[PDB]
Design a protein around this ligand. Structure first.
Ligand SMILES: *[C@@H]1O[C@H](CO)[C@@H](O)[C@H](O)[C@H]1NC(C)=O
Ligand SMILES: *[C@@H]1O[C@H](CO)[C@@H](O)[C@H](O)[C@H]1NC(C)=O
Ligand SMILES: *[C@@H]1O[C@H](CO)[C@@H](O)[C@H](O)[C@H]1NC(C)=O
Ligand SMILES: *[C@@H]1O[C@H](CO)[C@@H](O)[C@H](O)[C@H]1NC(C)=O
Lengths: 111, 314, 163, 163
């Protein structure tokens, strides 16, 4: 299983839509749970990559509401409604339906 | 000329206001008797709980490992499905079951309940995977190492989400007072649970019980619903089963309690213990407890709606 | 369908038909308008009846772990009363719609009968068994003209008044 | 209302009426007895239908502070089942009384039609379009006598049998 990602760093300003796309070689959905296994991580420079959302739709406690994850069988999306200086990081989509965990290629966001 | 109508040798006997059992040239079914003995529900998300119980997905016995934070528009319960590994019972059980059946699956969001001065890795021989263990999201809060005073602890969790959280916890009534002192220490333990709409409190009551699942003590599994921007406070002196992850609703589902295997071969609408009632007919005589948008129950075995005329043989 | 001795068995395509037994021979044809109207009305009644419910019901009672006995009997009694009133409504509706279907068949039948009366001023009259005694002879043309609802009576009046 | 090609649009005051097309000219009149009976029957049906109920229900569920979830869901399910049965009964009642009012209008038309044919033994006959072909000449007195149910057919038989 290979984990692709979106195009390279986006030259987006503050307070606008930010879209990151993730695509999978296989299907990471269901398993009699219908819960589409996919994690999203943001990584600040010099800080460990803290998780954003888990199973691509469950927003974590310690993250803002602006991070919205849209999921499907193969395609996945992170959308940011109003990006600011606290959201600059590099983003990874990780599959964990199958045992060889492959992270995403990294999607840096640029102000 | 001679003017007349049509008739057949073998028609159908139908019920009528004036006479009962009148002979008609053709008639149609009204009450649906044909039952599909399968939960065929294609086009809808479906989880088959199996050996797992609906409440167990909230609390996490070993049989409910697979469906701990599921998400589906059709929740299927089984009679073999058990809700607990360690023996116990949920208070206000059917209210929680009906909340779970209309949840669209559940999510688990961590409480951040750090604990100092106590041992939190509860271990029971009944709730077994690789040794003496406990539930998925429950910490059985024991003493430090042996008989010792459990410190009075106040832990507050604030539901910062925009949806009402489903808070759950447990109360351990030991098999004896000596066992209660072994696990939590001496003294009369008293636990209060405070919220804006929840003020119920209680005292654990050690005592001898029949050996259910190889254990004597029982866990009363209490629960509440937290509104958005609301905090719950657990003030426990001892004998507590603290939650780890608060449960959160997802959306709208429709939960069934069936006993047949699941497939995806029908655009089914309502389901019951006997299977699925696929029909456009207005009435059915299969099960009185079918839930969903489908034909409705009647007492008559079979109703004949007259489609043709009053035929008379030639 | 009351004054008729029996219904025809050879009438297959149409619900309401016609027989001639004239000098040309014997023929059994089928009317189209009356049976089309009757089937349209009855199929519309069925399509009104054949309709799955929109209202969504959830599980209120647990089959495996029995609920508290007082609220359990309350649920059982409410469901039993609803089942009884639904069985009542179903049998009442089935009885009265079978009655209305039989009455609609009779109404279409004697509507065709009375329109055949209206098409035949005095060239024909009833026998009481559902047959019309034609007082003129045609080579199976006026048979279809009665059937096609394109019958002219004024040209057949002069030879049927004196008989 | 079956054999009529189309209902009249110029008739306003009543429900059932008459057209003249006689030698005096063309005129439209309105019958009074049949429309009075039809409106009386339909208004009685409305009066027995348009009635606020005597039974006075009480507030069983709380809108502001939600009641206990088990008994609350029992109340919700009972109210949903009663809503479904009341909606079904309302559709049933509306459909069957609309059918009965349509059949009542058809039967009032039929009763007026048969009473007009009963008034005029052989002086007039139907054509199939809802009209009557008068076989005698009379300047609006005979026709108003037909409307007034005072028609004396005995003095018109001699000139209508030969025609
Ligand atoms: C008789 O009614 C049934 C409805 O159950 C229908 O399927 C069938 O086509 C009908 N047959 C005829 C000859 O009308
Ligand atoms: C609770 O807090 C959230 C965000 O902190 C806020 O949007 C919400 O209005 C608060 N609740 C009330 C009742 O004010
Ligand atoms: C309620 O009715 C169901 C059948 O629909 C039956 O199985 C159950 O035993 C009944 N409950 C009681 C308490 O009798
Ligand atoms: C019961 O129905 C009312 C409206 O009829 C609705 O507002 C309420 O939420 C329902 N209760 C439950 C528990 O769904």
């Amino acid at each position: 299983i290979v984990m692709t990602q979106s195009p390279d760093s986006l030259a987006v300003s503050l307070g606008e839509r930010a879209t990151i796309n993730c695509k999978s070689s296989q299907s990471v959905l269901s398993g009699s749970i219908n819960m589409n296994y996919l994690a999203w991580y943001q990584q600040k420079p010099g800080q460990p990559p803290k998780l954003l959302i888990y199973w691509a739709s469950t927003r974590e406690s310690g993250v803002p509401d602006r991070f919205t994850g849209s999921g499907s069988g193969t395609d996945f999306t992170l959308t940011v409604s109003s990006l600011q200086a606290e959201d600059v990081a590099v983003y990874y989509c990780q599959q964990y339906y199958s045992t060889p965990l492959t992270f995403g290629g990294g999607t840096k966001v640029e102000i | 000329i001679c003017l007349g109508h049509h008739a057949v040798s073998n028609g159908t006997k139908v019920n009528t206001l004036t006479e009962r059992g009148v002979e008609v040239v053709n008639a149609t079914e009204t009450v649906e008797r044909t039952n599909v003995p399968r939960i065929c529900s294609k086009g809808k998300r479906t989880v088959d709980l199996g050996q797992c119980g609906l409440l167990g997905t909230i609390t996490g016995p070993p049989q409910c490992d697979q469906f701990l934070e599921f998400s589906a528009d059709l929740i299927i319960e089984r009679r073999e499905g058990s809700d607990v590994c360690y023996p116990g019972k949920f208070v206000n059980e059917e209210a929680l079951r009906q909340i779970l059946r209309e949840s669209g699956g559940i999510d688990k969001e961590t409480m951040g309940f750090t604990y100092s001065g106590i041992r939190t890795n509860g271990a029971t021989s009944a709730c077994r995977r690789s040794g003496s263990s406990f539930y998925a999201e429950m910490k059985w809060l024991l003493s430090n190492t042996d008989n010792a005073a459990f410190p009075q602890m106040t832990k507050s969790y604030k539901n910062t989400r925009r949806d009402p959280a489903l808070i759950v916890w447990g109360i351990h009534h030991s098999g004896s007072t000596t066992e209660q002192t072994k696990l939590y220490g001496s003294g009369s333990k008293l636990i209060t649970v405070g919220s804006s709409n929840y003020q119920q409190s209680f005292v654990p009551s050690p005592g001898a019980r029949p050996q259910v699942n190889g254990q004597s003590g029982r866990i009363d599994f209490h629960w509440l619903i937290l509104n958005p921007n609301d905090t719950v406070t657990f003030s426990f002196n001892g004998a507590f089963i603290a939650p780890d992850r608060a449960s959160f609703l997802r959306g709208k589902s429709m939960g069934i309690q069936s006993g047949v295997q699941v497939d995806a071969n029908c655009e089914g609408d309502c389901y019951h213990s006997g299977g699925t009632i696929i029909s456009n007919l207005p009435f059915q005589n299969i099960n009185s407890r079918a839930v969903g948008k489908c034909p409705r129950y009647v007492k008559q075995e079979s109703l004949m709606l007259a489609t043709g005329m009053k035929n008379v043989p030639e | 369908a009351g004054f008729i001795e029996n219904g025809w068995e050879g009438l297959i395509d149409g619900w309401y038909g016609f027989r001639h037994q004239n000098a040309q021979g014997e023929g059994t044809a089928a009317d189209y308008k009356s049976t089309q109207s009757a089937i349209d009305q009855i199929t519309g009644k069925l399509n009104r009846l054949i309709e799955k419910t929109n209202q969504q019901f959830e599980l209120i009672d647990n089959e495996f772990t029995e609920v508290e006995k007082q609220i359990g009997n309350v649920i059982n009694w409410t469901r039993d009363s609803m089942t009884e009133v639904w069985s009542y409504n179903a049998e009442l509706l089935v009885a009265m719609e079978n009655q209305h279907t039989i009455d609609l068949a009779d109404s279409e039948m004697n509507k065709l009968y009375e329109r055949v009366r209206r098409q035949l001023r005095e060239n024909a009259e009833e026998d009481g068994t559902g047959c019309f005694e034609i007082f003129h002879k045609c080579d199976d043309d006026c048979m279809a003209s009665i059937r096609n609802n394109t019958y002219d009576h004024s040209k057949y009046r002069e030879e049927a008044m004196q008989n």
